[PDB]
Amino acid sequence: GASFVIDCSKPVEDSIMEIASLDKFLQERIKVGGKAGALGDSVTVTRDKNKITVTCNSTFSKRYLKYLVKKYLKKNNVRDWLRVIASNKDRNVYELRYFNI
Amino acid sequence: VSLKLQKRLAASVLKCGRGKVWLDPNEGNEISMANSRQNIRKLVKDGFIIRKPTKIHSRSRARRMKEAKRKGRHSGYGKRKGTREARLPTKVLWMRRLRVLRRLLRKYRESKKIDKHMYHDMYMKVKGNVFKNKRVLMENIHKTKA
Amino acid sequence: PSHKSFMIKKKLAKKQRQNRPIPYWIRMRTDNTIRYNAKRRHWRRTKLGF
Amino acid sequence: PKQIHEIKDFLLTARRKDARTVKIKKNKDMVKFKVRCSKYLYTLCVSDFEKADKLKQSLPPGLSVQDL
RNA sequence: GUAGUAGCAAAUAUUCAAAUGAGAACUUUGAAGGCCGAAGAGGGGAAAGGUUCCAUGUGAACGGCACUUGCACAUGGGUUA
RNA sequence: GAACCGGGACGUGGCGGUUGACGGCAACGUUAGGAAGUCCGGAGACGUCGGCGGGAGCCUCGGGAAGAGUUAUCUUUUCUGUUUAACAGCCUGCCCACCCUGGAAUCGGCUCAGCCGGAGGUAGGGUCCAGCGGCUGGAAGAGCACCGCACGUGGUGUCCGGUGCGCUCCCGGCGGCCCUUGAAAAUCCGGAGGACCGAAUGCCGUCCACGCCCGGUCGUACUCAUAACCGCAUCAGGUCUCCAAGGUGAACAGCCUCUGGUCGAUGGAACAAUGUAGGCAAGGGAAGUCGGCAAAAUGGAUCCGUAACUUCGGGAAAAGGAUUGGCUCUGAGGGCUGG
Ligand SMILES: [K+]
Ligand SMILES: [K+]
Ligand SMILES: [K+]
Ligand SMILES: [K+]
Ligand SMILES: [K+]
Ligand SMILES: [K+]
Ligand SMILES: [K+]
Ligand SMILES: [Mg+2]
Ligand SMILES: [Mg+2]
Ligand SMILES: [Mg+2]
Ligand SMILES: [Mg+2]
Ligand SMILES: [Mg+2]
Ligand SMILES: [Mg+2]
Ligand SMILES: [Mg+2]
Ligand SMILES: [Mg+2]
Ligand SMILES: [Mg+2]
Ligand SMILES: [Mg+2]
Ligand SMILES: [Mg+2]
Ligand SMILES: [Mg+2]
Ligand SMILES: [Mg+2]
Ligand SMILES: [Mg+2]
Ligand SMILES: [Mg+2]
Ligand SMILES: [Mg+2]
Ligand SMILES: [Mg+2]
Ligand SMILES: [Mg+2]
Ligand SMILES: [Mg+2]
Ligand SMILES: [Mg+2]
Ligand SMILES: [Mg+2]
Ligand SMILES: [Mg+2]
Ligand SMILES: [Mg+2]
Ligand SMILES: [Mg+2]
Ligand SMILES: [Mg+2]
Ligand SMILES: [Mg+2]
Ligand SMILES: [Mg+2]
Ligand SMILES: [Mg+2]
Ligand SMILES: [Mg+2]
Ligand SMILES: [Mg+2]
Ligand SMILES: [Mg+2]
Ligand SMILES: [Mg+2]
Ligand SMILES: [Mg+2]
Ligand SMILES: [Mg+2]
Ligand SMILES: [Mg+2]
Ligand SMILES: [Mg+2]
Numbered sequence: 001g002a003s004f005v006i007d008c009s010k011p012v013e014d015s016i017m018e019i020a021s022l023d024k025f026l027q028e029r030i031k032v033g034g035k036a037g038a039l040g041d042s043v044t045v046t047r048d049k050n051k052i053t054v055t056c057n058s059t060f061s062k063r064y065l066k067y068l069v070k071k072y073l074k075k076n077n078v079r080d081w082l083r084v085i086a087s088n089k090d091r092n093v094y095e096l097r098y099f100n101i
Numbered sequence: 102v103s104l105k106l107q108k109r110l111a112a113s114v115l116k117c118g119r120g121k122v123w124l125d126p127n128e129g130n131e132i133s134m135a136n137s138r139q140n141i142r143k144l145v146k147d148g149f150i151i152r153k154p155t156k157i158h159s160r161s162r163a164r165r166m167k168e169a170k171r172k173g174r175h176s177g178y179g180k181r182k183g184t185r186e187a188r189l190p191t192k193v194l195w196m197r198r199l200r201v202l203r204r205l206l207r208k209y210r211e212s213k214k215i216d217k218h219m220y221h222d223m224y225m226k227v228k229g230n231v232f233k234n235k236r237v238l239m240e241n242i243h244k245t246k247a
Numbered sequence: 248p249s250h251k252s253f254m255i256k257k258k259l260a261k262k263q264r265q266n267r268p269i270p271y272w273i274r275m276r277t278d279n280t281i282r283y284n285a286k287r288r289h290w291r292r293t294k295l296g297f
Numbered sequence: 298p299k300q301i302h303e304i305k306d307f308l309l310t311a312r313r314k315d316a317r318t319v320k321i322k323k324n325k326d327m328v329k330f331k332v333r334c335s336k337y338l339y340t341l342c343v344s345d346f347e348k349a350d351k352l353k354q355s356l357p358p359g360l361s362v363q364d365l
Numbered sequence: 366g367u368a369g370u371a372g373c374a375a376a377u378a379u380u381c382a383a384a385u386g387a388g389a390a391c392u393u394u395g396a397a398g399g400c401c402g403a404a405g406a407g408g409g410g411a412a413a414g415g416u417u418c419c420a421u422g423u424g425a426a427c428g429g430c431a432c433u434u435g436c437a438c439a440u441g442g443g444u445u446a
Numbered sequence: 447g448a449a450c451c452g453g454g455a456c457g458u459g460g461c462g463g464u465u466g467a468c469g470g471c472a473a474c475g476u477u478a479g480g481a482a483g484u485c486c487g488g489a490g491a492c493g494u495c496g497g498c499g500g501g502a503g504c505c506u507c508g509g510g511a512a513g514a515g516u517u518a519u520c521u522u523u524u525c526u527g528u529u530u531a532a533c534a535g536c537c538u539g540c541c542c543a544c545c546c547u548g549g550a551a552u553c554g555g556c557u558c559a560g561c562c563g564g565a566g567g568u569a570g571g572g573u574c575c576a577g578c579g580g581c582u583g584g585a586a587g588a589g590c591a592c593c594g595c596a597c598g599u600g601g602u603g604u605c606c607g608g609u610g611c612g613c614u615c616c617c618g619g620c621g622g623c624c625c626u627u628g629a630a631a632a633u634c635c636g637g638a639g640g641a642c643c644g645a646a647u648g649c650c651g652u653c654c655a656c657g658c659c660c661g662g663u664c665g666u667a668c669u670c671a672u673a674a675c676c677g678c679a680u681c682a683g684g685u686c687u688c689c690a691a692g693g694u695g696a697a698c699a700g701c702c703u704c705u706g707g708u709c710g711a712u713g714g715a716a717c718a719a720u721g722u723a724g725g726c727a728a729g730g731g732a733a734g735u736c737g738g739c740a741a742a743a744u745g746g747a748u749c750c751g752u753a754a755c756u757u758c759g760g761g762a763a764a765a766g767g768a769u770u771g772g773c774u775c776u777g778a779g780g781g782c783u784g785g
Contacts (some may be wrong), residue, residue, distance in 0.1 A: 032521060062511070064522040075515055086512070088593060091450050093689095102385055103393050103434095106420085112492085118407095118706050119604050131394095135422085138712090147597085152740030154514065158704040159524050164507085164691060174776090179770030188747095193611045194779090196498085196558045201780070218552065223380040229555095234408060234779060248412065253664055259415055268439085277424095290417055291436075291674070298448065300583040313735055316656065322587070329583095335657065337534080338448070340583055365587055 002060040004050040005093040006069055011082055013050070017096075023047040026065075027056065066094060077087045102133045107150075110141045115152045121237040202227045202238055215242060255297070262288065280282060298338045303338035304352055307341040311356055321353065345352065 012018045027045050034036050039045070041059040054065060066084050073079045080099075087093040104124055111122045124132055128149050135141050144150045169175060181188065206227065210220045223242065232238040269284050288295075307330060315335040319348045322329040328349040330341040343349040356360060356362060 034522090059509095059510090061522060067522065071517065071521095080515095085593065086602080088600095091602080092510080106392075108394090119703095120707075124394060126383075129394060144599095155526065156704065157515075157525060158692070160506090160692075161524060165509095166693090174773080175771090177770065177772095178748050181696095181770085182694095184747070187696035188613065192497085192558070196611085197780085199558065204781095216553065221554065224556085236779095248414080248665060248670095249668090250411085251415090251665065255415095256665080263416070289437090290415060296413075296511085298584040300536095302535095313656080320587090322585090324586090331587095336449090338584075338586095342583085 003055045004062055004065050007093055007095045009050045011096050028066055107132050111150045112164050114141050118150050121153045125149045141158055191200055301339050301341040305306050320363045320365055322365040
C-alpha cells in the first residue's frame with residue numbers, strides 16, 4: 001500500500017490555483033497498468049480544501065506524482081512561480097512553495 | 102573590473118572547473134570585493150556565485166538502439182565490419198559449450214542417472230565435438246540407456 | 248628542478264638578491280657615475296650556466 | 298581503534314590511569330561508548346538504550362564524560 | 366637608395382550586450398555559436414630552468430597589430446615531514 | 447582525529463620451572479613458553495609469449511528517494527549525484543600445496559588447452575596459503591545532495607538489486623619459447639647444535655599485554671612546454687613517463703559527444719591575373735611523358751570459387767562471381783532453485 005499527499009496551501013490561499021482542477025488532472029493523467037485514466041480500484045484520488053491525497057493498492061512511485069504535478073503547473077503557466085518540494089516532516093508529502101527571488 | 106581571481110577561487114571552492122562557475126553579471130562590484138576564500142564562500146551562500154549544471158549528454162538514444170538490437174535490428178550483413186571471429190571468437194563459443202556439457206554430465210553422474218562408465222564415454226565424445234548443444238546430449242543419453 | 252642540492256639553492260638565492268635596481272640615492276652621491284645596474288639578469292634572456 | 302565486546306571489560310579499561318576521556322554517541326539503533334586511551338580508542342556498542350543508562354552513571358568519577 | 370616595398374596567410378570562429386577606461390576587434394562578466402574529443406589543446410611528475418609562483422600597482426621599453434593587458438616592469442608575500 | 451615505525455628506560459600484570467608451555471593420529475594450531483661460540487636454509491630475488499581463473503576501480507541495466515531539464519503534443523521520462531581511508535579484531539579459505547581414512551581394469555578423475563593415479567587415484571573428512579574478499583570498530587560526529595531559519599544555525603536523505611570474450615591495474619595457475627635460461631648486496635626470518643644458568647619454591651627466565659620517553663640534516667613554490675627545457679626568439683622542430691569517459695565499429699582507426707580546457711594565433715574591405723591546397727567534367731582512354739609522374743579506380747564483412755609454379759610450408763585476399771538498408775517476425779544456442 002501507498003498514500004501520498006500534495007499539500008496545496010500557499011497557492012490556494014493566494015488564489016494562484018484551483019485545488020479541484022489539480023484533482024481532475026491527476027485522475028485523467030495517472031497511468032495504471034500502462035493506460036492513463038484507468039484508475040479503477042487500485043488508485044483513488046481524494047481532495048480537500050487545501051490538500052490532495054493519492055492512495056494506491058500496489059507499488060506507486062512518489063516521484064511519479066511529482067512528475068504529474070509539475071506537468072500540471074507547466075500547463076497552467078505557473079512553474080515560474082511554484083515548485084514542488086518534499087517535506088522534511090513527512091516523507092510522503094509534497095508541498096507547493098514559491099521561489100525566493 | 103577583472104574578476105579572474107574570483108573565478109579561480111570560486112572554481113576551487115565549488116570543486117568544479119572554471120567553465121562551470123557562474124558569477125552574477127549584475128553584482129560585479131560586490132564580487133570584485135571578495136579577495137579570500139572566506140569571502141567567496143559567503144557569496145556562494147548568498148547565491149551570487151553558482152555552479153552551473155553539467156552539459157546534457159543523455160543515453161536515451163543508446164538505450165533505445167540497444168532495444169532494437171535486442172530484437173535483431175541493424176544486424177544484417179551491411180552492418181558488420183569485423184569478421185565473425187572478431188565479433189565473437191570461435192574459441193569463446195567452444196569454451197561455452199564444453200563448460201555447459203561438462204556441467205550437465207557431472208550433475209547426471211551425481212544424481213546417478215548415468216554411471217561413471219557412461220560418464221567417461223560421454224566425456225570424451227563431448228571433447229571430440231560429437232554433441233553440439235545440451236539438447237542433443239540429453240537425447241543421446243536417453244537413447245543409449247534404452 | 249624541485250629536487251635540488253643545498254649548494255645550488257644557496258647560489259640561486261644570491262643571484263636573486265643581486266637582481267635588483269640600484270638604490271635611487273646612489274645616483275645623488277658626489278662624483279657619481281653609476282647610472283643603473285649593468286648586471287641585471289632575466290631568467291628567460293640569459294641563463295646562469297649552472 | 299579497537300572494539301570492546303563486554304561491558305565488564307569496558308569498565309576495566311575506563312579505570313585505567315591513561316583513560317583521558319569518554320564520549321557517548323547515541324545512534325538511532327544503539328549507543329556507543331568510546332574511551333580514549335594512550336594507544337587505542339576503545340569502543341563499546343550497547344544496543345539496549347535502557348541498559349546503556351546504567352553504564353553511563355557507573356563510570357569512575359573524574360573521567361571527562363561527553364555526549365555526542 | 367632599395368621601401369612605406371617583400372611581407373603579417375598552417376593548427377576550422379567568432380558574435381551580442383553590459384561593466385571598466387582618456388582610449389576597447391584584442392581586458393573582465395554574462396549569453397550564444399565552434400574546437401581539443403581521454404595515445405587531449407585535460408590532470409601530474411622525471412630531467413632542464415630558477416622565482417617564471419601569488420597579491421597589488423605601473424611613465425617608458427618589451428610581448429614583430431593593439432592593449433586598460435603581463436611569463437614585462439615596480440613593491441611585497443610565498444616552499445613547514 | 448585516528449594509526450604506524452625505529453630506538454631508550456623501567457614499572458604492573460600475565461606466562462614457564464617435570465629448570466625451559468600446551469593442543470592435534472597427522473597436515474599443523476595457540477598470545478607468552480631457556481640459551482653462547484660455531485654451522486645450515488629461506489626471504490630479499492628477478493626473461494618473454496599465450497590461454498584461462500580471481501580481486502579492485504571504471505563502464506553499463508533496473509527499482510527507491512532528492513533536486514534539476516523538457517512539456518502546444520509525447521515522455522511512470524531525460525540529467526546530476528545517491529560516499530566510506532590507513533589501521534585493529536573476527537570471519538571467509540580462491541587457484542595450488544599438504545594431511546588422515548581407504549585400496550582402484552568394466553580403469554577412472556579432469557582442463558579452453560593440458561594432465562593426474564599402487565611413488566596410492568576417485569571418494570569421504572581435514573590443514574595451510576592469497577585477498578585490492580565479507581562483517582564490525584575507525585564512522586557519521588565526516589563528506590555530499592537537498593530543504594529551512596538567520597544573514598551562524600536546524601532538519602531530511604545517503605537505499606535495494608542485476609549484468610559481462612567490456613576497459614585499466616593487481617594476483618593465481620598452467621602451457622609455449624631458447625646453441626638466449628633472463629643481477630647483486632644491505633636487511634630480515636627460520637633452523638641444527640646445547641657450552642652455561644634457577645629453585646627446593648623463591649628466585650631465575652620471559653620474542654606476551656599495558657603504561658612512560660625520544661624522532662637529526664637537506665630537498666618540497668612553479669613550468670614541464672605550438673610561451674617557463676634546447677634550438678640566437680613567446681621558433682609549425684626536438685625532449686622520458688603516469689591517469690584515459692559515451693556513441694558508431696573488429697578496434698586507445700576515423701567521425702561526433704560528456705568531464706576539463708579553449709576560441710591563443712593582428713584586423714577590415716574586395717573576389718582580377720599568377721599561385722598554393724582541395725574538387726569536378728561531355729566523347730575518347732596513356733594518343734601525354736624518358737617513364738602512367740600525378741590522379742583515378744580497388745577497398746569492410748558474409749557466401750561461392752581460386753591457376754601456373756613450389757623448397758609442399760606456400761602461392762592466396764590469387765583470379766572470378768554474388769550479397770549488404772529499413773521494418774515486422776520465426777528458429778537455435780543458457781543460468782539458478784524444487785524428489
Ligand atoms: K620536472
Ligand atoms: K626524512
Ligand atoms: K598503510
Ligand atoms: K610541496
Ligand atoms: K616547442
Ligand atoms: K586567384
Ligand atoms: K604512355
Ligand atoms: Mg573481438
Ligand atoms: Mg582456433
Ligand atoms: Mg631557452
Ligand atoms: Mg657560458
Ligand atoms: Mg604589402
Ligand atoms: Mg607567408
Ligand atoms: Mg587577411
Ligand atoms: Mg588558422
Ligand atoms: Mg583573437
Ligand atoms: Mg577534428
Ligand atoms: Mg569535435
Ligand atoms: Mg596508454
Ligand atoms: Mg606591438
Ligand atoms: Mg602570473
Ligand atoms: Mg621581473
Ligand atoms: Mg634465496
Ligand atoms: Mg609467438
Ligand atoms: Mg578478469
Ligand atoms: Mg581428497
Ligand atoms: Mg561501520
Ligand atoms: Mg551527516
Ligand atoms: Mg600497462
Ligand atoms: Mg634448540
Ligand atoms: Mg608542488
Ligand atoms: Mg599550472
Ligand atoms: Mg604534463
Ligand atoms: Mg646556446
Ligand atoms: Mg559494438
Ligand atoms: Mg576511438
Ligand atoms: Mg572525361
Ligand atoms: Mg563520361
Ligand atoms: Mg576502356
Ligand atoms: Mg607514347
Ligand atoms: Mg609523343
Ligand atoms: Mg603513382
Ligand atoms: Mg601471383
